[PDB]
Symmetry: C3
Subunit: 118 residues, 3 copies
């Protein structure tokens, strides 16, 4: 399972509509998951500085069981997510950063239990 | 100490008013803490996909010193938080997920120090 | 590199304008980084309880490579961030909490790779 959170200082009406769905599909493909095991949250209109600058930017966080635990894996993911997001948001590559967080099954609550038991 | 963050794509005017307080009380009871050691943040009106779907949903994160570090503990918490949130938000159990994060006292800043020293 | 996220239940028009920039500068100084290696996200207008109370409050999270991994380091940071934020937000010291999260270079995506390779 994958969880993506995207904070941006672009106003909601400057984020291309439906981005949460397209990022869900992109993340399924990049991380190697079916679309029904991917989650995306987009939070626009925030006040942000990225690398010291308040120019338009976005911060992506990716959490996942399994696939985000090494530099080699995350370098690959990063290349693809930067390509996707720079194009969608009309941002330079200097205006996006990503954080990757490994998760374990005992940490994910699903249908009233945790994934350890599913 | 417990910290709960709830993201939802329900508009603010569709989230039952006061949910942050009722979730604080529920989390105190579920996690085994007095209400004054529990924190809740609700972020409505977001653009979200959960399990690949943009239908109404919510994502809960629970961070805590002590009580969220095993599958057995988190299964118990999950059952109770799913019962609470499905009813409050009028959501099916397929429309909520939870992530659990253990914290340590050196990670929590309180009154200008950290909890290690309190 | 440092990442700060600040959630508050103060409405956007009650947060002193430009706080994301001033917090970026403060965090550069406190954490020992140049301003171009610091990131800040402010999310106002949220529904929050802190220590069981829905009175005005703020939650700060600080993630960083290197400097947030011990009680001694975080006690020092906490004193300075509490001084900065209590004054900016006109909040008592009981109305702010901080969480600190160490990061490693393989977890940070930057310019289409990860920091391990930069
Ligand atoms: Na997280
Ligand atoms: Na967190
Ligand atoms: Na984080």
């Amino acid at each position: 399972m994958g969880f993506l959170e995207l904070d941006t200082n672009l106003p909601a009406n400057r984020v291309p509509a439906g981005l949460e769905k397209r990022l869900c599909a992109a993340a399924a493909s990049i991380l190697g998951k079916p679309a029904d095991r991917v989650n995306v949250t987009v939070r626009p209109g925030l006040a942000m500085a990225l690398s010291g600058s308040t120019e338009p930017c976005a911060q992506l966080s990716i959490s996942s069981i399994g696939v985000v635990g090494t530099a080699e894996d995350n370098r690959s993911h990063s290349a693809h997510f930067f390509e996707f997001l720079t194009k969608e948001l009309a941002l330079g590559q200097d205006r996006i950063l990503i954080r990757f967080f490994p998760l374990e099954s005992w940490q994910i609550g699903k249908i009233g239990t945790v994934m350890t038991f599913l």
